[model samples]
Target: LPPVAAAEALQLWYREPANEWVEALPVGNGRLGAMVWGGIAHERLQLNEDTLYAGGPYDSTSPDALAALPQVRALIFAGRYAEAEKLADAKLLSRPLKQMPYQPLGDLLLDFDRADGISDYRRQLDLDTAVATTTFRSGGAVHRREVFVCAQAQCIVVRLSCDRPGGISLRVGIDSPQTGEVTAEPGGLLFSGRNGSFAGIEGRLRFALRVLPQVSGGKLSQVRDRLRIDAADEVVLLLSAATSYQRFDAVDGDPLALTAARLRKAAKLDFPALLRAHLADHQRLFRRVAIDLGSSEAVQLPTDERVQRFAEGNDPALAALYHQYGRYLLICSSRPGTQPANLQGIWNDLMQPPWESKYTININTEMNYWPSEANALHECVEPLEAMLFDLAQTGTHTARAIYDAPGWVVHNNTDLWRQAGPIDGAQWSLWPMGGVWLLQQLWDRWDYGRDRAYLSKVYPLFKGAAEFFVATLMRDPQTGAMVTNPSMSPENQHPFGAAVCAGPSMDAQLLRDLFAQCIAMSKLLGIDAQLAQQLAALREQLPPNRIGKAGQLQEWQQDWDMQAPEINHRHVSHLYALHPSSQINLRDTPELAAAARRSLEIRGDNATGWGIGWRLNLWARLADGEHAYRILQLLISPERTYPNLFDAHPPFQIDGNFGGTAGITEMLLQSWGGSVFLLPALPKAWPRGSVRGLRVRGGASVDLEWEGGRLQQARLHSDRGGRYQLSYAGQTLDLELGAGRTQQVGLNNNRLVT
Candidate 1:
């Protein structure tokens, strides 16, 4: 079969017509996310779409929650826990409500709850939430609730502000349904649960808070319940106010003012409407495409039974990607599915409030949808598209404001306000390379779908990104070569710089690629002919990457005297041609490849506290399996866990863990640069396995199985017609790939042969 035909067949498979199975799982950042619902607890909880959290309140200073962020950050930065804990304790602040502690623990406790009202309330040992079931009592008074459970990260989240103000008495105690033993906290109402029969219990458990307020000179009391579970499990706390004390009935009677029915109804209506309003326009566009891309096959498990068994037992990170892809497909295809509102709400939440506080347009947020888009969630780009356009406008504004020039806007980061402006002292944020990276996705869609209309609409945006670099690159005063000063590798800084502005090889390479992409887009669109010629001219003017005295790519041009610092940051700026861009190839540019290899060697493999994600990708590019596996272990280590899955910084941070998952995907299959390369960086330790449904460029889906370090079977399907050259094990096989065809090729020692 021809490679072009294979590419077209794969594209059709991904764009296939389906509804129920289109998206059954929710994926983000290449991991599967569980369902989030907003309502009262019952045996059969109605999984509605609208039930989601909008960022009310949380405590960052709580003991257990505090332990996770610093500890995780420490592990990434220094790979030391004791030292991380010290740092976490030093700056940690104790706050009112502990919100961070619940995320880690919630995953573990999900199985205990049966969603039945009368199953066994007596055995319930988890936290009880009243999110949509709170009510207003006489004159709209308030109540207080608390729980005490012994876990790794022990803390409480309480709701204080209410219609009426009053002091609430707190109590902590443990009640066991099996032993019928109730233990109360000494000298206080809060009692912590021991890890015995009460081990990992879910729902309301031991300890209660009583609020006594003087209402018209009369004593009025309200009761708040507390639940304590394992620290590693992510949990939710729902606080609802009611006019009067109601019995805890599984059904019928309303216990609080905010009933589950009201929340569910509202969510049901809101989710579909939001989907229709915000997502429908993109869906209509996708429907106009004249193709049917089939889905990729299921991911293959390791052939080694032990490895497979261990992976299955331990919960592979790939599972999360599957779920996320499923969910994305469901939404993209407009299929009917159910999950909690919190999980689904991330779409709007990340765009607007709460989650948006943590920059939305970072690599972590953007990479979440890459897999989904290829796997058939094209509509997932809607929100990101809207956000990027908004960023582009802001970039234009910032260019005028800061540089006193006319071009596209550039910023170091995307804040909650969607602000895109230059950062004065921050090296990484001021680089203005991110816009170029984002533009690649648009190019990718065009490469796969060949959608000229879509390309025309998005062409100007790409041109604007190129314009930013065109205006920003400064010619070196001494050499007259284009230099990107004040540019730093992402999350990395110059060692000897005082003003915190210096250009690095990564930024330079990114600028080069951005210019080349503009040239390609112009040629494809045939509209920006003059601009394309100028861009081609400028690409030659861009300076070559500098090799420093330390034998690594020089991080800064001016500081040639300074040595490359030993940090966990593996930003292989010199290897820009290998990934995210296609300027350099091992077969074509041997000298450049040698330079890239030296840069990786001299720098050594290490992850900055927040640079773990980028490091994983870097290592994968180097094909360092042992290093990737070690990094993966470090990310999910036991020391990083709180009661919930939220990683503690040496003390907890969860971002690296998420990035590790994405890195694993990149290592297994890379689709950048117009070709699907298998096991570009497969570690020796990852001996045998099969991966299915991975979407590659030119609308191709690849499935491969390997045993004993040799590929046993390989399959390719293409949805759009294209020829492909398969390169593996030092041999290039010329296969006539075409549309709507599946071809199988046998491999010997990782090389494909007829």
Candidate 2:
């Protein structure tokens, strides 16, 4: 785990250039995204602006939604699911029942004139530098290309160079699938466009992209809509883009002014300056964590081949690279003053992408940010927190129109405009826990950092979600427990062929988490005393996790968890209390944890990519390292991971990548239940390794090294230090630390040494 070996493991190298989007390397600066295809003759850089989405602001809530809610709940309770679904579809759902689709900005094309004798071609995405580079020997000259998006510069920079002077020549242009026009400008090409509409809504978003070319020793001229560079020693292209979206509800910003301002400032910096700025800005966050799991000779192979051979044997370094790549993507796509990462992580080509590339608050959106705090990237959660605040405003109207409740409520899916009404079908959209689940993330951020100022700022958001549930939860007629009247287990259905039910296990779990966190936060802030007491009584009355006759956690209130066609359904929502929320764990609650393990065993392992990522953490929570390791292999294998390491739901989804990284962090270091557990679920395959800069709860950072499946050394440091309970290898130690102190603990003769 030396410095050299760690840097070498971070490079994703390929023997050949990419021919399609799936194989292309991705680079972004939080707001802008691009896919680089290292082509020998015709290189393509697919571009994306974060705000370029279809559809404008509109209220989707129906006027008669609240009037129909009572009948829908009554029918669901009476076991008339078909009639309930019909009524809900007619009057209780969103007017269109769908959100807008995120759109692509355009593509930047570079066609090199010389295309003969291409050899020694290599393309790589360096995690340390946050840059994508392509190098090759063509036409008796060594040519190199470097691409990166700079957050400070607000532009995409590309440098094309040749070892021999006057050996580089190419044509650059911009094209888009949307309604746009390309024109030749003074120094480069300009593309002006508007996004397409969705569900019969007219698109209102306007966007602009400007590419400026700077030549070191070449003649640059405009030809039609492209810029031609003739025999240049080196070429640099600065691309800038902006949208008219000032906010989700308003398209009033001037795209022309924004793009012009970005290019004017970026054009002053040379290639080295831009790259230096980007590296410093990126590595300041990326360099906070390092992991070494041990590598094999297979590490020298191409990344794709390594993945193909991953299932055959072990490639521990590849696993570590995958883990870091998830962190890298989060840093690239989600930052302050930018939109949060989407299902695609801000890299999408399709105008109508799968699932609309929206924020699926049910699980996918929350999964996208799973590694933020654990990996020491707390700032990346800002954009998501910002979006949640926006939803807090928009969802208020949705809450009143749909359920006549206080505060706010969001259904399973939402887009840039913050659509909060029920969407799609009853199976997925009937659940109202999306807003509640997101509020838990906000509390987690405070839990890890313990920033009282941040907690005070977000306490209103926590109370807002609690208010919605407090006003809406009804008592179950049979069980005499408080439950959501019209809720379904995320996307799962019962054996009776109905997704609509009186109460589902997942809803109760999410509500319990929300109510409990609200109570604790209220006490910490010294406000909302009455609300805290009300929620405390309500938390006990909520439906508890039940064990089925088959020794599995029930997905519904009844024991409807037996074998059926959906015995291995993709959505394992009943285990929500296990991993993310430590309401049930093997350490404190062994019986419930055993039932969760049984539910996972009955569900099996074959699932979509993100589903497997969830199971990986679920198994880790059960302290079953081998089972978790098996799930990790399935996740990083060729079937789930693509050539460029983008996760595949068979179509490309980024949640699995983030969730996989979170699971790895969970296995190595866990800080739940008021204690820091080191190597809680260390798999036997990783016998010797080290992980540094992993953040635990109670404002501490952990560094650890292990050998021969045992902890060799540990370092616990915190700026705001306090007493901590450290656990490892079936032993515990109590340590008191002062501010800015470091405590290193080791073992001697199977006992503690400090």
Candidate 3:
């Protein structure tokens, strides 16, 4: 196969102006985020800091959260669900254990003077270089603008120049609704603010900018809330931000003073050199994987138009662009040293954003990293690992005081402070399974990177969380199996009547995963054999997944208690085993697998943003390619997708963007079955395409090419010796994979050969 070009594989382009914020391109270092609007006359760079969540630190943990646990369980088993819900809501739900919403730093408004007579407008987000450029002809000259968030320098770099001197002129400044002090110094402008206190902790955040013109005589003055750059020939702007979110033992700085120093320091480095350093760090991960889905006529159209065309017909090239767009977002949102990507992935505007832009750990946070490990961005998953440890540190208190459990515990919501208490309501809260669900990422981290050190680091997170599960759960008197009370299946109600009930399937499945992971880690580390055996026995005690009368997997403990699948419940929590858990599959549990299929069939694809991604993955796990592709089509469709292709939870949630991306990779490569599965769910429309540098489990990476919806060639290499079986199109072959070497495979009609 010919080498895949970086240019062809990575760039996402648009031929028109992106006035809408969601349509605007987003660029970020793991620490900071910005939505780039390439407006001809008025450009807006909406900005965010990963730690700029509202409030300082709040302990929202319920005072008597678990005191009513026994009552809730008793009522649930007694069929007094409404009374149990009332009891749980009052006593168990977090009155304040809520996540502080992620907040905006401010917007960088560039009001251009030479707005008239603009032509040849174009903007592109280069995933390869992590730069977004907007080029247009204005005022009888070609004007160009380049902007990128630099991971190395820790600032957002903006460069404005033109063919004619002074052709580039704009008034640039920062302003936020919550900006406390807007001032300008001799060097630059500063915007700083303090977020309102929560449970006693106060948040002070700030943004600073330094503007320098290559050719001098440009006036730099403060205009109320903005810094004016009057008629500069070529101006280089440096933007930096800070927040007092000092979780993870962050330095205690005003964030105002910190960013001020960062801006001044960055102003010293030359633009090209800084960008080179940034690219060296960014491209190492970005360029590891390349994909081509065959060019199409739609490729020549504007992105918005191209998407409409894709909706009308099968344009594989458009699909490829969307696929790459996910990878681009992952690199922008999650990386080492920055915070893990949240529901909004570090890009948002408004003083009050939806879902508070914090991590929704139960599903959204996990979905954010779904593409990272498989797509070879294992380094990007570190922040999540870091956060989990933070959660553990905070969750230990939750475990000890609330449940009196042995391990750490967290609910569905977590903020910068690692809030571990149940938030929201009985309909959505009181579920203490978030920490368990998140523990799986540790194992996934090892699978993709094969980092033994990483395994050692994250194994404690698993063991600690497993201890919490073991101590918190008890055998139900009726079922005679381990069960969790005060559990809700994450935003979905039980079929019988209550939203908060005992032993929701999602919780049950997560406990199983938690126990299984601990066992695996204990074996890997070659210690704690007795602890591993204890976890294994505990896993066996948990009740197995059950089937209801409707032939669908049950969401609650009892078979008679189930929700209506077609009634628009977005969360299919019971199917966790099928996806992130890998406990159920068509080849192994055909009956349960078929029931899972019926579950998907009853529930239509159009849920909210993340549900579509979940369904896509579930279909892929079931090895149904065409159906999975249909959901992918639904995800990028006009309804669910924002104009800029961000997942539209009406107000732009980012989980669907990540979830769909993971779904695509799942279709192409799967490692959950302890071996490598190639083209396990390739849609018919995506034929004659190639994918390179996709990492798999067993300390291996794979590259595959397919034509006419069939695998033609494959390359497999591992850093650890292991026995794996390759499952593809119903053809099974044992793989004798060796360490530290590459092996090529060819697929003939009869069979496959090395």
TM-score winner: 2
Residue range 1-754, candidate 1, lDDT tens digits: 1111122121101111112211111112111122122111211111111212112222122244323442434332332423433433343222221111111101101122212222211111011110111212223333211221111011112222224433222221222212122222221222122111111222231211211111121122222332222211122222111111111111122222233332333333322242233233333322321111112232232111212232232434332332222232334222222121122222221212233223323354444444444444554455555556766776676555544456675544443234454321233343556666666666767776677798888877888877776776776554566766434455443454321333456666777777777788777767778978988888887767665655555555543424434443534444555554556555556566556656666655544322455556566665666776555544444443222222234332334433444566667766654455666766655556666655666767777666665556668777765776555555566666667888787875545786
Q: Give lDDT tens digits, candidate 3, residues 300-333.
A: 6666766666777656776766777788788888
lDDT, model 1: 0.41
RMSD of each: 16.7, 1.4, 2.4
TM-score of each model, in listed order: 0.57, 0.98, 0.95
lDDT of 1 at 636: 41
lDDT of 2 by residue, 478-525 (tens): 788988988888788787667888768988888888888888888898
TM-score of candidate 2 on Cα atoms, chains taken together: 0.98
* CA lDDT of each prediction against the hidden true structure: 0.41, 0.88, 0.77
